[PDB]
Write a protein that binds this DNA or RNA. Structure first.
Lengths: 341, 98, 233
RNA sequence: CGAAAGGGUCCUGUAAGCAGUAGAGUAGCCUUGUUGUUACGAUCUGCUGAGGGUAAGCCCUCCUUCGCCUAGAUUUC
RNA sequence: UGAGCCCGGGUCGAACGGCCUCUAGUGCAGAUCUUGGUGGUAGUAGCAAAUUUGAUAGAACAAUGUAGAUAAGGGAAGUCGGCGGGAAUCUGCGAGAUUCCCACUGUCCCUAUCUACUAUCUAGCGAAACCACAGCCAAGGGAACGGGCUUGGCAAAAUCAGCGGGGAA
RNA sequence: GAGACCGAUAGCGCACAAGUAGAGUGAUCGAAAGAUGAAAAGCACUUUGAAAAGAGGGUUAAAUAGCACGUGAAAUUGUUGA
């Protein structure tokens, strides 16, 4: 095997560390660099290829695409890093009041037997006109810091999982002066941020996950931290539309979830990201989407995508009925349904 | 002990064959009823010709493999002592050469 | 002591027998596998080979003949004995609840097994007619006493004591009677009148059993006593 | 939350039983029959896209039902 | 100086010492020494002989593969093989019409079948070989002699599972 | 009757069950193993508990002299402490 990925180590953290963010210049407008979702599953799409010089140009092409359920993330903190002859280091972080129950579950380990005391004195410090200390921390960040990251958490209470502990991650703010980005984060406190806000249509990104541990039949084989580069978001669905899987070509009002729901995941009701190709990780797992560190060098990026339809047959079997309507129409009436009626 | 159970069941068959036919069937119903009684109470009786014979066969096979494991290990140990004496005589001859 | 209730005795199952077996399992809680879902390809061999490692001591089998007659086979794992009862009259727990003016739903009482109460069965010899007493009735007593966990009155918590299982024998010790087995289930309600009044509420099912036939092993062995067929010596 | 149900979805292939002169034919009985009749007979026709299963590593329920609740043992400035 | 001698403290209960001589079965680390006692290995290997027959007790499990065989199949290779049976297709029961294969081998592999060999955990029992003292690596160390030593690289308790480095003709 | 002898791994193989126990078909081979206390006065009795075992209590000048018993080294082991 490759020497860059050996010896085979377990992923120390189930989440997945971002390590490297894109390089910062002040000239661009302000923007976050990362987002999180949960791998729901994959479907099949067919596409009118728009690759000049390709054999399959202007032809139907069938591809496999991963669905990542992406509920809005909540901004709950800012952090200010300082550059030192020993690297970057956390100078100081500011939190937000009214921290969510789920982010508190992240702060705790045994939530059921612990009286909820975390960040209570911090909320008190906010409440009792220690805004002196608040503005002191913000002024320190604006004066001494060169890199700022927004602490954002994703919300299991909207995701369709038995989990109840939220997911936290630091996301760098690039494109602007330090004061500008600190003010932007201060505005960001206590507001949901959508994937329409973080990312956008038909674009190339990087994806971080932990590839599955193949356990129970020379050592650890599986469960490895992997950041797969160069995966193209083709679609962003809205949840509330109910015409998410619907495409201009077929006016079939359906959601991205096939018949019977996703196998071993469920049914998604939120914003979702549909990306080309196989992507590391498994279902229910946290997926970390981030921007590319470098400007792209291919027409695969900045190639605009036009879709036709999305496979919504039940993946639990070899079904061929996209919608319950067409299924109940084609099969006709059955004796059990007739007796019920 | 499977051998003790075999002895007991052999005595049982001798008694069954000695007693007369009508009370063959009578006492036979008797120990079946009582068998159901104590086994349903929970007493796992151990009386089966094939089961006990196959248990004895398993025990004999285990003893056989164990005896073979002896022969291997004992031969290895004797070989070790013989080899040690062999290079001792080798080095004594080397000294005599010197 | 663990017991399982299975429908593998019948070639196919219906709503009535399914409800009956669900009620029997509810009676057998908590020492029974509630989530046991019978499949057509399963067999008695598969179920006993499951009982083996599961440490199940008793197995009720509900079979249905082509004529529609229903039989209850109470077997002791893993080698017998086997008792064939015939169904004469049965009522569902739903029907019992509907008939009762104040039906009580099962609750926390699922945590406690019912106490066995046994009536009119003749253990001691009254007429030396040992064939029915000294062969069948003592085995019945032992079989049910082992079906339910042994009860020590000197350690059992009275507040946990909540359910009773009645087995009443329509038969007299003089070997005269209809030889009928009456199986019923009651819930205990303790009311403060210390003087405490005990009220028993039907939970079902009601079971009319005909003691038909017996086997030494699991659906195998010589016929020890068959009511209709007596084999010559 | 975690033990039945309901709905969804996949799988196999049309369950038992009943009704069909349908069934290669066979053996009897009568006034001898262009649905003769009584007995045996693999197998075909309708109930019947039937029947059954479906989480042990498939989804969703508004109480669809019922139950369980602030434990108990040690350690840490 | 030394082999050794004297005293203090504890234990202990019946004999003992200094000097001059006389005498000898008179002084131990070795002898793969003798006898006896006791360790690491080790609560490890494994339940094996020993400890009126014989006999560890519960929980499990029924698998995983291995070797030797078969007038079985398939694939592969080489030849001078391939140009009645089975498998199908087309057409309106049709002599119905049309298409594919069959060989051998003192050759290789796999799958199929037979015989034989194979099994874990916790309790209880419980050895033996071997042991001058211990083992990171690199260069140097005259005598192809390194584990000592010199100069460096460095160097953090303790377990389980894999793994490779050393020990003359 | 004695000894410039040996003093329980010594002295005869045997200070004591010694040609005993034991081995081998047999001729034959052949060990290990002494000491309570002056006197058993050998721990009455109570109390644990299945035992070749303790806690009290008693005998003796002494029981850490208790039929594992005159004194009780080293190897080896445990607890406490540095």
């Amino acid at each position: 095997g490759s020497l860059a990925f050996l010896p085979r180590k377990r992923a120390a953290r189930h989440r997945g560390r971002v390590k490297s963010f894109p390089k910062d210049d002040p000239k661009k407008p302000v923007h976050l660099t990362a987002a999180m979702g949960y791998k729901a599953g994959m479907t099949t799409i067919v596409r009118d290829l728009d690759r000049p010089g390709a054999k399959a140009h202007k032809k139907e092409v069938v591809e496999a695409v991963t669905i990542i359920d992406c509920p809005p993330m909540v901004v709950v903190g800012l952090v200010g890093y300082i550059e030192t002859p020993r690297g970057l280091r956390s100078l100081t972080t500011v939190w937000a009041e009214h921290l969510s129950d789920e982010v508190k579950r992240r702060f705790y380990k045994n939530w059921y037997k612990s009286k909820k005391k975390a960040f209570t004195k911090y909320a008190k410090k906010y409440a009792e006109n220690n805004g002196a200390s608040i503005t002191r921390e913000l002024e320190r960040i604006k004066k001494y810091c060169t890199v700022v990251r927004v602490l954002a958490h994703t919300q299991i209470r909207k995701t369709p999982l038995k989990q109840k502990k939220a997911h936290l991650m630091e996301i760098q703010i690039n494109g602007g002066s330090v004061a500008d980005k600190v003010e932007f984060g201060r505005s960001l406190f206590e507001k949901p941020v959508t994937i329409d806000t973080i990312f956008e249509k038909d674009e190339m990104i990087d994806v971080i996950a932990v590839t599955k541990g193949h356990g129970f039949v020379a050592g650890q084989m599986g469960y490895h931290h992997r950041t797969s580069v160069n995966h193209k978001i083709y679609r962003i669905g809205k949840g509330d539309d109910e015409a998410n899987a619907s495409t201009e070509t077929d006016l079939t009002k359906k959601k991205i979830t096939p018949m019977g729901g996703f196998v071993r995941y469920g049914e998604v009701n939120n914003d979702y990201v549909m990306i080309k190709g196989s992507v590391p990780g498994v279902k229910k797992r946290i997926m970390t989407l981030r921007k590319s560190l470098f400007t792209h060098t291919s027409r695969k990026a900045l190639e605009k995508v036009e879709l036709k339809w999305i496979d919504t047959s039940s993946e639990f079997g070899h079904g061929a009925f996209q919608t319950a309507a067409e299924k109940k129409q084609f099969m006709g009436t059955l004796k059990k349904d007739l007796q019920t009626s | 002990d499977p051998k003790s159970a075999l002895m007991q069941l052999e005595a049982k068959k001798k008694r069954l064959e000695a007693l007369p036919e009508e009370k063959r069937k009578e006492i036979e119903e008797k120990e079946q009823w009582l068998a159901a009684r104590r086994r349903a109470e929970g007493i796992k009786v151990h009386d089966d010709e094939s089961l006990l014979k196959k248990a004895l066969k398993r025990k004999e096979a285990r003893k056989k493999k164990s005896e073979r494991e002896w022969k291997e290990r004992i031969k290895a140990v004797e070989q070790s002592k013989q080899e040690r004496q062999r290079k001792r005589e080798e080095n004594i001859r080397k000294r005599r050469e010197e | 002591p663990k017991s399982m209730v299975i429908r593998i005795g019948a070639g196919e199952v219906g709503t009535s027998v399914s409800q009956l077996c669900t009620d029997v399992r509810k009676v057998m809680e908590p020492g029974t596998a509630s989530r046991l879902k019978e499949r057509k390809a399963n067999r008695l061999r598969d179920y006993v080979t499951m009982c083996g490692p599961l440490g199940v001591t008793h197995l009720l089998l509900f079979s249905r003949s082509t004529s529609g007659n229903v039989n209850l086979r109470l077997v002791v794992a893993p080698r017998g004995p086997t008792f064939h009862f015939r169904v004469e009259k049965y009522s569902l727990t739903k029907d019992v609840r509907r008939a009762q003016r104040h039906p009580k739903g099962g609750g926390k009482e699922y945590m406690t097994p019912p106490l066995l109460v046994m009536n009119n069965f003749t253990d001691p010899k009254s007429d030396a007619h040992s064939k029915v007493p000294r062969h069948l009735e003592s085995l019945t007593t032992t079989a049910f006493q082992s079906l339910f966990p042994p009860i020590n009155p000197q350690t059992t918590p009275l507040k946990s004591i909540r359910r009773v299982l009645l087995l009443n024998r329509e038969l007299s010790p003089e070997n005269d009677g209809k030889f009928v087995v009456n199986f019923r289930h009651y819930l205990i309600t303790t009311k403060p009148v210390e003087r405490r009044a005990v009220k028993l509420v039907e939970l079902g099912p009601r079971m009319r059993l005909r003691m038909t036939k017996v086997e030494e092993g699991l659906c195998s062995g010589k016929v020890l006593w068959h009511e209709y067929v007596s084999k010559s010596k």
